[model samples]
Target chain A: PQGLAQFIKVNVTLENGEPVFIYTDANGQVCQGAITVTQAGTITYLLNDQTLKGLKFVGVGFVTPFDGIIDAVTISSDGMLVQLVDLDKTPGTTKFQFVLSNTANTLLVLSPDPQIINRPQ
Target chain B: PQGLAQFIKVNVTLENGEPVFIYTDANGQVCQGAITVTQAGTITYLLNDQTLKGLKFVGVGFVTPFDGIIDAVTISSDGMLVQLVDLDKTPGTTKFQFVLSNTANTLLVLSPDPQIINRPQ
Candidate 1:
């Protein structure tokens, strides 16, 4: 078992199921899609092109002290994925790695702690 | 001197010293005029009749928890001044105060407590 290294959890659900989380600067909109997971994982987010309007995808991001970097970008027929390239540096030494995972839609990092059962998860 | 009461601070600096704080229901503009001082104060904001455009002002604001209320208003003969009407409740009790002061422009509330002195006094 991973000795519970400091990591965050992410979850996302959208109202009206509109891909509100899908956006890029090209379209002149903000990013709000998210993904939920149980580990400090990496994900990808793609900028979908909705020409005639009415199309957006959501994704989750980890909230951390450092800035988030985009790892992978996948714009598939199913939806989109945004992988956060988290900066991992431990105390006396420096090491880095990128792990892939799936999550809800939203982009922000959160501090990790043991999470209890959800209301209806 | 009054045992350091809890009140928000506000400051405004107009780029052109024009009236940007003057907005109202009929005009449909946002309130952004303000005042400052050493007491719990009261102030108001009014909608000014700026002709054909080309007028605006700047402001400073106190970032606090509870929302600030508008106390009094004024228009210009030489210049204008807006007052702030603040809501007061002790650490928990309610004691709203709106001391009048001449501030720059920007509408918002305050949290009263010891402020860390920063920069030029």
Candidate 2:
């Protein structure tokens, strides 16, 4: 039996030596989509570098906190992924900040454009 | 800039109505492969259901606990992914148990042929 899960693929690229994160859903929608937890479940977001150029996900912070809907945030052992635990304490909207690093040890913080997590009514 | 990361895809199927987990690495290696964190980092393991027949990851438990090498374990909000945070406190090997639930609300635990997490010397 398969459990309910949502996967979002994050594509990181360099623009003018600055890191840019593109969050795409399974539908190929870029940064304009909302991940709705119909019930209490988890959503796993992954960072992908098909080119293997050295872009890695370091951490994720909440720009607009989940408030009570999200119980916790977990980063993978390798820092390539971040999992959000949505307990669905309340129905609302939230945002996040994605942090990435390169081989040169430069850190990039992306906060302006964030994917939204919605707990639908 | 791509950071060092290793992804292991977990394929779940039902045999004798019991859950069977098949862990494959990027090299297409089965459970025999080892995910080594050369430096201190994080590793994100994902569960896939290409068939979409209803398989989902619920939780992960360590049969052979990571002890200190792993600082923490996080499950996603959707419960489809689990992230292991490795601080690399010690160089050693550890094993885990994969938990899954079906549409029927049945829980399956895979512990015998667990994947290995290695903190290399």
Candidate 3:
């Protein structure tokens, strides 16, 4: 799961090939999602539905919640790492921040308050 | 605050600037650190010492515990976001992951068990 990151209507399902991302969009579409890490080290988006396309996403090569390519990575001396990716919305200009850790295999996304960065949910 | 990320001897002294990062190095160097986010959206590492430089540090333009540029941002529909930054270690290969939350003002670091990803302490 290298290419995939940041998701909404988030959920998980293990009824088949283990746990897969599961969720329901505002359109009432039951969907499943997951990360696809490519051999080129790029993370891709995987969805069973085409409707979710272009809804906006961030993955191995991009940052979700916004659209753009990867730009930089920052790590705290204490081992804390933060990925600084760029976005395309709001005039296609920016490096949206995504903070995570190294030890835990799970990546934790950020949800800035609407009053904060002005980035959409 | 913006241009800074990642550190080991990470220590913070907010006695004036609020809460700064704090820590100690194995070499017995008691140090204090903090993130410097510029209005230009660049993160800069600020240290009181010149000895800690070139110690494989990662920040606004680099990944802590590594050395490289930032790349992409991925967000789970659930508001989960992950920054996909690159690293310069392990043969200069990169993209050190740092996961965090929007609700949190603090960036959590990762520590892969020594038994895991060969990244060092």
Candidate 4:
């Protein structure tokens, strides 16, 4: 966690038990399907491939030194994992980890503390 | 800033100066247009009204407790201000503010401090 990571992986699981994971890009899109993060620090979101229409972008301070810009992001379909990198830029350390609940329409911030909390058997 | 707010007002300005503010919305659309956040904490986004296509919803934890759900959001077109409420549901009290740079494509987190920094004359 001390060194700069090219990417960071995050797992998403909703309380209501939705098969696929979802999040609200600041743009106000109810993205039911895929979401994309651009190098320009912008987001283009889509919904369950419905009717196939227009999508929008919303700005947000996803990381520290909050310039409202995101460096990069990558996601894994099988594992429900996401990787975002370069969020804080050089000279500044401190990133963020989070969770979501589409059931209640809530986005809560979590303490991205060190020492992974692995599942107990 | 002390009490519960039905909405919050935040000003968005980029380092490089591009008109019509933009954000990533966590979903990853280089949205040059509109974005939406659903009551179930989902995000739907669009581009500059281009070729209308399928838009997806991305889940995010915009506020504390990281459930990745959003309660409500309202934006002011004239002032470049955004208001989000019920982010940190009952018992939890904390919120966030942010900035965006389309040219730099950055999303910087704001202090959200109460001490207002008025525009200098």
Order the numbered candidates by TM-score, best leading.
Answer: 2, 4, 3, 1
Give the higher-DockQ candidate: 2 or 4: 4
B1-121 in candidate 3: lDDT tens per residue? 2332333333323233122233454464654333222122222222322222111112111133212223222333442222333222332232232322221122222211110122232
TM-score of 4: 0.32
Off by over 4 Å in 3: A1-96, A99-121, B1-7, B15-18, B30-90, B95-121
Question: Candidate 4, which segments miss by more than 4 Å at Cα?
Answer: A1-70, A75-79, A85-94, A97-101, A106-121, B1-9, B12-71, B74-81, B85-94, B97-103, B106-121
Positional deviation of residue B103's Cα in model 2 after best superposition, in angstroms: 36
Name model 2 segments beyond 4 Å from true. Answer: A1-3, A27-31, A50-53, A64-66, A106-108, B1-121
DockQ of each: 0.02, 0.02, 0.02, 0.20
The runs of at least 3 residues in candidate 1 whose Cα sits more than 4 Å from the true structure, single-residue gaps closed, are: A1-121, B1-34, B52-83, B89-121
Candidate 2 reaches a DockQ of 0.02
Please, what are the lDDT tens digits per residue for candidate 1 over residues B25-87? 324433232223233343333323232222221111211212222112223333333333332
Per-residue lDDT over B1-121 for candidate 4, one digit per residue giving the tens place of the 0 to 100 score:
3432222222233333222223444344333222223222322222221112111112222433332233554434432344444333333223332332222333323322211111111
Best by lDDT: 2
Give the TM-score of chain A in candidate 3: 0.23
lDDT of 2 by residue, B7-120 (tens): 778876655444456778788778566678666666777887543436555445442232455556667887677777765448777665454433432222233354577777
lDDT for B11 (candidate 4): 24
Candidate 4 iRMS, in Å? Answer: 7.5
Among all windows of ten consecutive residues in candidate 4 chain A, which has the lowest summed lDDT?
A: A48-57
lDDT of 3 by residue, A2-103 (tens): 332432243333233212344454454764432222221322122322221111122111123222223233333443223332222332222332322222
